[PDB]
């Protein structure tokens, strides 16, 4: 960790931002100290009502003046809350932006050796893209919110203890029980959720391995143990979900009951103090509510400390590269700018080792002379760090031992400003920049005109990707629409190097894109551009090696031989090995509800529970208003009885909550968990039925599919269980509150009726204030972050051409747009929040004024205005949640999109077809008509061109891999992993696509290539090929596979975990189990697949005794790229790029003098 302290994180503050922070803090304190003052004014107006019941002259003036004070308070909140959101959020944008401009400069100042081509560059780009966002959260409006809510607590206590210290002390002493109950509830919820996830880590995870190893499960009957096991696993998750739903019960009910008891106690003490003669009704209420709010605000105040630690750590991580001192210092004074460059580069015993891994040695005793104005090249035997000279010449690593002389002048005695111009680099795949092609050329020389650009393009023939463009000299490679990669690229690096017109040029192995006509074109382009230059070429193939004046061959640390191509080929001096190696190369909601048809009895009893629970708020508000009126009785005798009755009402309501809440939250949880289990079972049953090719897509891999099937499905519950209880409860509370409010008094309730939109909008704004007004801050900064990431990932190219000063000229001019967007967002949010709060506090001063006016005329009476005001305000409070859940109702699929995306997806091949004819017996004949296929992952490949083959019944075939010319593709076409794009597949006198292949695959077996085993013991693993596992043939399988002397010799016997659990066996012995599983099936047709030398065991004691059983009485087809233990007996064919031309036994193939078998003989001799 070693995190930086919270202070000094503002160290990037301008002299103007301090004023912004000061104004923000000053506004925040005032905005936080407002609610208690609102309670004080409300208490004063209640006192004005109470004290003047028999004199309707003073009360009018008091209500008028207090309504005016409410108007003033609303104005203050309007002009204070705006200074908290408009001065803190903006100040959090002028610092992070001012920090990135320094951070990227620091990154681009360091040496290239710091990025040693690994995950370090990924870490740096992740820090740039994501970590600065975390820094921006610790200095944004979160600190303003924290100050706001702490000042609220302080002001509440102050406006508390001063009024009536006893009542405030009671109020602050009763809240610890509620806080402790809430903490216990949260801890229990977290523990139960963790236990549920750990239970989900049980066999409910085996779905991912079944999906990954889908080829083997489709090869056998499968689809039964893969689903029954999943159901048995998810049963436990269902049970723990029931327990979790229970936990969502007693916790909330007990908290509400303790709250109700506390309210009853505090009101009873207020009522016993009021009759003594200490305080008044308008003061005890003020003290109680101020103390309650002050106590409750501290919990929200401390909720912001979570992000502060992350922000501190993020700031510490950033403040590491900033203060780093570069190893190489660019001092213009030390280096004297020279001229008359010649091109003499000479080594003086330059031995260097990488600082990251100094154990290895790279250039032990390195001494080769580079002539001026002459072409030389160095070629290595293999890829043993060949691309190392380029880094050393361009000064990316300081030579620890040795010296490099440039025209007799040491490079270390020169500044790194004008030296880099003399060297041009074209490395392996020089990544272009996602800008216009016009300014890509300008990197060589910032000051250039169009004519030299055209001359450079013509020199490198940069016209086949430029002249015939949709628009002139305008194309963004990063943009998808004009993405013009197209495999090979007309290398613009050639043109940008020619623009410099240097005398030293560097070229790496830039031929790795299926050398073709375009490669030849760029080859003669290069041959044109090497004129009078000290070019150095590194490559592996000998095509470019021939066109070199002098060739240097290195083996390790030093050059083994020099001379020229005609000399190396002579006498085979240190060159026969080189050529030997070279030659060896939406209606969703209705149907979701319909899916819960068997949950009919568990929905009604939850709905009635929600309806019953909906009667909590209005009754509590009614009792509060009634007791508020009761406090002002003249005769003290009836007060005791009324308060006792109301305390009894509170005590009853506590148990009513401890009831109704559990009743609501239990059955709904049951229904949600049942729905999740059903949808998960159906999802797996549908995804396993899908075709093989849909699994091959890069978007659809095992990890993402498992994540969607494991995590996304849970959200379905939140879309059908939690999202329906709250709406019903709030709606019924709203209705039952309006009914009572209208019954009590209607002519005053109409004013509130006309003004619910204002109060609801204001409370919605208050609710949104807790989340933050910034909004999706990553989307705005993604465009800027792309520039930094692309400049860091391509550090090799930007290091040359002196492009460091140019990157921080587009970065600065592009960073300004998010700043303006943030400023506009901040201003709009502040103004709207201020207007909303003014509407809130400006409307409550009208209802009370009209109520007082009505009382003055005698039409209405006290105990009626206050009731309809309090109950209606409290019920308008609840509408905020209903409004907040609105955007996630109509806009379905926001997170719950996988529920029907793959469940209702239509397949092309249905394994179980009722109309398909059943398959009883098969003779075992394989033949293909004129059929070709293309992989669905990338249909551009068209290797198959009119493919045909035949294997007679009761025979064997020995197809050769033929250098991987689609060798592992015929294995996937004999049985229906894929479908023929054209032509017909012929078998057993019937077309393949009219028979029930589920009944057909049970008679055909194959052998896997890459070893893989299920997370289960090997008793049914070898019995997976048949239904019914009896030890009689279990031992027989081990004897046939010859694993009986090995598997049964294990100390723990057969009952042992062999997959990704318990003991992990070697990869060279999993083929024993693989071949043991096949013998149980005893298929009429057998398939083999050996490739990539998966055995790696000389004198195999497995294949020799198993292949003999393999041929006996079976039609076997074998494909392999190795001429070892693949001796055919009936017919052998050779495939060349998706086509065969010769057929017959091994005698015919060996009878050919040379034929196509000579190439296979070459590799056979290579095996030796
Ligand atoms: C934030 C949740 N929370 C802290 C644990 C609660 C929850 C409930 C209460 C009740 O006082 C209460 C609030 C409003 C309306 C009625 C009632 C009621 O009396 O049931 C409370 O004070 C605090
Ligand atoms: C003066 C009476 N009065 C104006 C009509 C109210 C009453 C209640 C609230 C609630 O916000 C509230 C206050 C404190 C604790 C919990 C809660 C709660 O959420 O139930 C309020 O804002 C204003």
mmCIF file of C-alpha atoms in Angstrom, residues 173-385:
data_model
loop_
_atom_site.group_PDB
_atom_site.id
_atom_site.type_symbol
_atom_site.label_atom_id
_atom_site.label_comp_id
_atom_site.label_asym_id
_atom_site.label_seq_id
_atom_site.Cartn_x
_atom_site.Cartn_y
_atom_site.Cartn_z
ATOM 1 C CA UNK A 173 -29.718 8.292 23.656
ATOM 2 C CA UNK A 174 -32.448 6.227 21.977
ATOM 3 C CA UNK A 175 -30.873 6.160 18.477
ATOM 4 C CA UNK A 176 -27.972 3.803 19.425
ATOM 5 C CA UNK A 177 -30.451 0.925 19.575
ATOM 6 C CA UNK A 178 -31.640 1.628 16.036
ATOM 7 C CA UNK A 179 -28.060 2.001 14.804
ATOM 8 C CA UNK A 180 -27.016 -1.290 16.412
ATOM 9 C CA UNK A 181 -30.039 -3.071 14.941
ATOM 10 C CA UNK A 182 -29.233 -1.735 11.477
ATOM 11 C CA UNK A 183 -25.597 -2.762 11.784
ATOM 12 C CA UNK A 184 -26.528 -6.276 12.884
ATOM 13 C CA UNK A 185 -29.003 -6.512 9.999
ATOM 14 C CA UNK A 186 -26.349 -5.453 7.479
ATOM 15 C CA UNK A 187 -23.762 -7.857 8.906
ATOM 16 C CA UNK A 188 -26.219 -10.761 8.790
ATOM 17 C CA UNK A 189 -27.132 -9.923 5.191
ATOM 18 C CA UNK A 190 -23.476 -9.832 4.142
ATOM 19 C CA UNK A 191 -22.745 -13.133 5.877
ATOM 20 C CA UNK A 192 -25.728 -14.870 4.291
ATOM 21 C CA UNK A 193 -24.820 -13.545 0.836
ATOM 22 C CA UNK A 194 -21.240 -14.782 1.229
ATOM 23 C CA UNK A 195 -22.508 -18.203 2.308
ATOM 24 C CA UNK A 196 -24.834 -18.270 -0.708
ATOM 25 C CA UNK A 197 -21.968 -17.510 -3.097
ATOM 26 C CA UNK A 198 -19.792 -20.175 -1.467
ATOM 27 C CA UNK A 199 -22.658 -22.647 -1.893
ATOM 28 C CA UNK A 200 -22.878 -21.586 -5.541
ATOM 29 C CA UNK A 201 -19.178 -22.481 -5.869
ATOM 30 C CA UNK A 202 -20.394 -26.091 -5.522
ATOM 31 C CA UNK A 203 -21.162 -28.309 -8.552
ATOM 32 C CA UNK A 204 -23.185 -25.427 -10.025
ATOM 33 C CA UNK A 205 -19.833 -24.313 -11.466
ATOM 34 C CA UNK A 206 -19.323 -27.484 -13.558
ATOM 35 C CA UNK A 207 -21.406 -25.833 -16.274
ATOM 36 C CA UNK A 208 -18.320 -23.927 -17.440
ATOM 37 C CA UNK A 209 -16.229 -27.065 -18.002
ATOM 38 C CA UNK A 210 -19.128 -28.828 -19.729
ATOM 39 C CA UNK A 211 -19.401 -25.837 -22.071
ATOM 40 C CA UNK A 212 -15.640 -25.719 -22.649
ATOM 41 C CA UNK A 213 -15.363 -29.481 -23.305
ATOM 42 C CA UNK A 214 -18.471 -29.465 -25.482
ATOM 43 C CA UNK A 215 -16.925 -31.571 -28.258
ATOM 44 C CA UNK A 216 -16.565 -34.640 -26.041
ATOM 45 C CA UNK A 217 -20.036 -34.295 -24.500
ATOM 46 C CA UNK A 218 -21.563 -34.065 -27.975
ATOM 47 C CA UNK A 219 -19.469 -37.017 -29.179
ATOM 48 C CA UNK A 220 -21.221 -39.234 -26.620
ATOM 49 C CA UNK A 221 -24.916 -39.153 -25.746
ATOM 50 C CA UNK A 222 -24.419 -36.640 -22.909
ATOM 51 C CA UNK A 223 -27.002 -33.943 -22.074
ATOM 52 C CA UNK A 224 -28.349 -35.953 -19.104
ATOM 53 C CA UNK A 225 -25.687 -35.966 -16.383
ATOM 54 C CA UNK A 226 -24.785 -32.412 -17.433
ATOM 55 C CA UNK A 227 -28.302 -31.233 -16.514
ATOM 56 C CA UNK A 228 -29.306 -33.494 -13.617
ATOM 57 C CA UNK A 229 -26.093 -32.630 -11.772
ATOM 58 C CA UNK A 230 -26.757 -28.928 -12.348
ATOM 59 C CA UNK A 231 -30.281 -29.263 -10.947
ATOM 60 C CA UNK A 232 -29.024 -31.170 -7.905
ATOM 61 C CA UNK A 233 -26.389 -28.487 -7.324
ATOM 62 C CA UNK A 234 -28.784 -25.542 -7.643
ATOM 63 C CA UNK A 235 -31.195 -27.141 -5.166
ATOM 64 C CA UNK A 236 -28.794 -26.119 -2.383
ATOM 65 C CA UNK A 237 -28.639 -22.578 -3.751
ATOM 66 C CA UNK A 238 -32.447 -22.545 -3.695
ATOM 67 C CA UNK A 239 -32.483 -23.583 -0.028
ATOM 68 C CA UNK A 240 -29.920 -20.953 0.953
ATOM 69 C CA UNK A 241 -31.935 -18.425 -1.045
ATOM 70 C CA UNK A 242 -34.970 -19.299 1.054
ATOM 71 C CA UNK A 243 -32.881 -18.685 4.169
ATOM 72 C CA UNK A 244 -31.649 -15.383 2.710
ATOM 73 C CA UNK A 245 -35.224 -14.293 2.046
ATOM 74 C CA UNK A 246 -35.979 -15.149 5.658
ATOM 75 C CA UNK A 247 -33.038 -12.938 6.648
ATOM 76 C CA UNK A 248 -34.665 -10.103 4.678
ATOM 77 C CA UNK A 249 -37.520 -10.491 7.178
ATOM 78 C CA UNK A 250 -36.938 -10.318 10.943
ATOM 79 C CA UNK A 251 -34.166 -7.760 10.444
ATOM 80 C CA UNK A 252 -36.310 -5.022 8.914
ATOM 81 C CA UNK A 253 -39.287 -5.866 11.115
ATOM 82 C CA UNK A 254 -37.257 -5.725 14.321
ATOM 83 C CA UNK A 255 -35.613 -2.459 13.270
ATOM 84 C CA UNK A 256 -39.017 -0.911 12.573
ATOM 85 C CA UNK A 257 -40.384 -2.210 15.874
ATOM 86 C CA UNK A 258 -37.486 -0.735 17.835
ATOM 87 C CA UNK A 259 -38.022 2.541 15.980
ATOM 88 C CA UNK A 260 -41.729 2.554 16.867
ATOM 89 C CA UNK A 261 -40.969 1.779 20.514
ATOM 90 C CA UNK A 262 -38.411 4.599 20.625
ATOM 91 C CA UNK A 263 -40.908 7.043 19.123
ATOM 92 C CA UNK A 264 -43.508 5.998 21.694
ATOM 93 C CA UNK A 265 -41.050 6.452 24.566
ATOM 94 C CA UNK A 266 -39.844 9.869 23.427
ATOM 95 C CA UNK A 267 -43.399 11.125 22.886
ATOM 96 C CA UNK A 268 -44.424 9.820 26.315
ATOM 97 C CA UNK A 269 -41.549 11.686 27.964
ATOM 98 C CA UNK A 270 -42.452 14.796 25.969
ATOM 99 C CA UNK A 271 -46.017 14.458 27.248
ATOM 100 C CA UNK A 272 -44.920 14.075 30.851
ATOM 101 C CA UNK A 273 -42.617 17.099 30.583
ATOM 102 C CA UNK A 274 -45.289 19.248 28.914
ATOM 103 C CA UNK A 275 -47.740 18.948 31.819
ATOM 104 C CA UNK A 276 -45.020 19.814 34.338
ATOM 105 C CA UNK A 277 -44.745 23.309 32.860
ATOM 106 C CA UNK A 278 -41.240 23.287 31.412
ATOM 107 C CA UNK A 279 -41.592 23.649 27.634
ATOM 108 C CA UNK A 280 -44.287 24.103 24.980
ATOM 109 C CA UNK A 281 -45.615 21.881 22.220
ATOM 110 C CA UNK A 282 -43.672 23.745 19.544
ATOM 111 C CA UNK A 283 -40.324 23.273 21.300
ATOM 112 C CA UNK A 284 -40.301 19.613 22.355
ATOM 113 C CA UNK A 285 -41.161 18.609 18.788
ATOM 114 C CA UNK A 286 -38.373 20.802 17.406
ATOM 115 C CA UNK A 287 -35.807 19.396 19.832
ATOM 116 C CA UNK A 288 -36.862 15.796 19.167
ATOM 117 C CA UNK A 289 -36.757 16.058 15.382
ATOM 118 C CA UNK A 290 -33.542 18.095 15.292
ATOM 119 C CA UNK A 291 -31.774 15.574 17.526
ATOM 120 C CA UNK A 292 -33.114 12.638 15.495
ATOM 121 C CA UNK A 293 -31.926 14.119 12.197
ATOM 122 C CA UNK A 294 -28.555 15.098 13.648
ATOM 123 C CA UNK A 295 -28.009 11.590 14.962
ATOM 124 C CA UNK A 296 -29.105 9.906 11.739
ATOM 125 C CA UNK A 297 -27.002 12.125 9.461
ATOM 126 C CA UNK A 298 -23.655 10.914 10.842
ATOM 127 C CA UNK A 299 -24.149 7.464 9.327
ATOM 128 C CA UNK A 300 -24.458 8.993 5.871
ATOM 129 C CA UNK A 301 -21.530 11.292 6.690
ATOM 130 C CA UNK A 302 -19.215 8.339 7.319
ATOM 131 C CA UNK A 303 -20.456 6.422 4.261
ATOM 132 C CA UNK A 304 -18.117 8.500 2.070
ATOM 133 C CA UNK A 305 -14.954 7.189 3.761
ATOM 134 C CA UNK A 306 -15.044 4.090 1.557
ATOM 135 C CA UNK A 307 -13.830 5.840 -1.591
ATOM 136 C CA UNK A 308 -11.247 7.979 0.222
ATOM 137 C CA UNK A 309 -8.862 5.068 0.822
ATOM 138 C CA UNK A 310 -9.053 4.012 -2.828
ATOM 139 C CA UNK A 311 -8.436 7.600 -3.902
ATOM 140 C CA UNK A 312 -5.425 7.869 -1.600
ATOM 141 C CA UNK A 313 -3.909 4.648 -2.944
ATOM 142 C CA UNK A 314 -4.586 5.769 -6.517
ATOM 143 C CA UNK A 315 -2.877 9.096 -5.880
ATOM 144 C CA UNK A 316 0.130 7.312 -4.417
ATOM 145 C CA UNK A 317 0.324 5.072 -7.487
ATOM 146 C CA UNK A 318 0.295 8.093 -9.798
ATOM 147 C CA UNK A 319 2.840 9.992 -7.707
ATOM 148 C CA UNK A 320 5.506 7.406 -8.559
ATOM 149 C CA UNK A 321 6.318 8.032 -12.223
ATOM 150 C CA UNK A 322 5.957 11.801 -11.720
ATOM 151 C CA UNK A 323 9.006 12.086 -9.453
ATOM 152 C CA UNK A 324 11.062 9.380 -11.171
ATOM 153 C CA UNK A 325 14.448 10.512 -12.475
ATOM 154 C CA UNK A 326 15.247 9.240 -15.995
ATOM 155 C CA UNK A 327 18.426 7.202 -16.332
ATOM 156 C CA UNK A 328 19.342 8.959 -19.593
ATOM 157 C CA UNK A 329 19.530 12.748 -19.242
ATOM 158 C CA UNK A 330 18.976 14.855 -22.366
ATOM 159 C CA UNK A 331 21.441 17.710 -21.829
ATOM 160 C CA UNK A 332 21.838 19.990 -24.881
ATOM 161 C CA UNK A 333 24.760 21.802 -23.230
ATOM 162 C CA UNK A 334 26.815 18.621 -22.802
ATOM 163 C CA UNK A 335 26.332 17.498 -26.405
ATOM 164 C CA UNK A 336 27.933 19.589 -29.149
ATOM 165 C CA UNK A 337 25.798 19.648 -32.302
ATOM 166 C CA UNK A 338 27.988 18.169 -35.051
ATOM 167 C CA UNK A 339 27.604 17.827 -38.814
ATOM 168 C CA UNK A 340 29.122 16.066 -41.865
ATOM 169 C CA UNK A 341 27.621 12.734 -40.859
ATOM 170 C CA UNK A 342 29.271 9.766 -42.567
ATOM 171 C CA UNK A 343 27.606 6.608 -41.242
ATOM 172 C CA UNK A 344 30.396 4.893 -39.300
ATOM 173 C CA UNK A 345 29.065 2.713 -36.471
ATOM 174 C CA UNK A 346 31.536 0.523 -34.600
ATOM 175 C CA UNK A 347 31.280 -1.669 -31.504
ATOM 176 C CA UNK A 348 34.078 -1.970 -28.934
ATOM 177 C CA UNK A 349 33.427 -5.222 -27.035
ATOM 178 C CA UNK A 350 29.845 -4.147 -26.331
ATOM 179 C CA UNK A 351 28.451 -6.707 -23.870
ATOM 180 C CA UNK A 352 25.042 -5.848 -22.420
ATOM 181 C CA UNK A 353 22.392 -7.595 -20.332
ATOM 182 C CA UNK A 354 18.787 -6.562 -19.777
ATOM 183 C CA UNK A 355 18.341 -4.767 -16.420
ATOM 184 C CA UNK A 356 15.115 -6.697 -15.776
ATOM 185 C CA UNK A 357 16.879 -10.067 -16.213
ATOM 186 C CA UNK A 358 20.642 -9.506 -15.853
ATOM 187 C CA UNK A 359 21.327 -13.222 -15.316
ATOM 188 C CA UNK A 360 21.367 -13.964 -19.051
ATOM 189 C CA UNK A 361 24.000 -12.505 -21.372
ATOM 190 C CA UNK A 362 23.075 -11.164 -24.804
ATOM 191 C CA UNK A 363 26.112 -9.668 -26.551
ATOM 192 C CA UNK A 364 29.227 -11.245 -25.042
ATOM 193 C CA UNK A 365 32.247 -10.097 -27.094
ATOM 194 C CA UNK A 366 30.385 -8.120 -29.758
ATOM 195 C CA UNK A 367 32.595 -6.400 -32.349
ATOM 196 C CA UNK A 368 31.394 -5.812 -35.918
ATOM 197 C CA UNK A 369 32.215 -2.753 -38.036
ATOM 198 C CA UNK A 370 29.549 -0.915 -40.044
ATOM 199 C CA UNK A 371 30.972 0.843 -43.137
ATOM 200 C CA UNK A 372 29.804 4.332 -44.056
ATOM 201 C CA UNK A 373 27.324 4.491 -46.925
ATOM 202 C CA UNK A 374 27.298 0.700 -47.216
ATOM 203 C CA UNK A 375 24.688 -2.008 -46.672
ATOM 204 C CA UNK A 376 25.163 -4.702 -44.018
ATOM 205 C CA UNK A 377 22.869 -7.196 -42.319
ATOM 206 C CA UNK A 378 22.902 -9.550 -39.332
ATOM 207 C CA UNK A 379 20.945 -12.820 -39.281
ATOM 208 C CA UNK A 380 20.486 -15.154 -36.326
ATOM 209 C CA UNK A 381 20.012 -18.899 -36.200
ATOM 210 C CA UNK A 382 16.695 -18.583 -34.356
ATOM 211 C CA UNK A 383 14.666 -16.123 -32.304
ATOM 212 C CA UNK A 384 17.193 -15.973 -29.458
ATOM 213 C CA UNK A 385 16.752 -12.272 -28.782
#
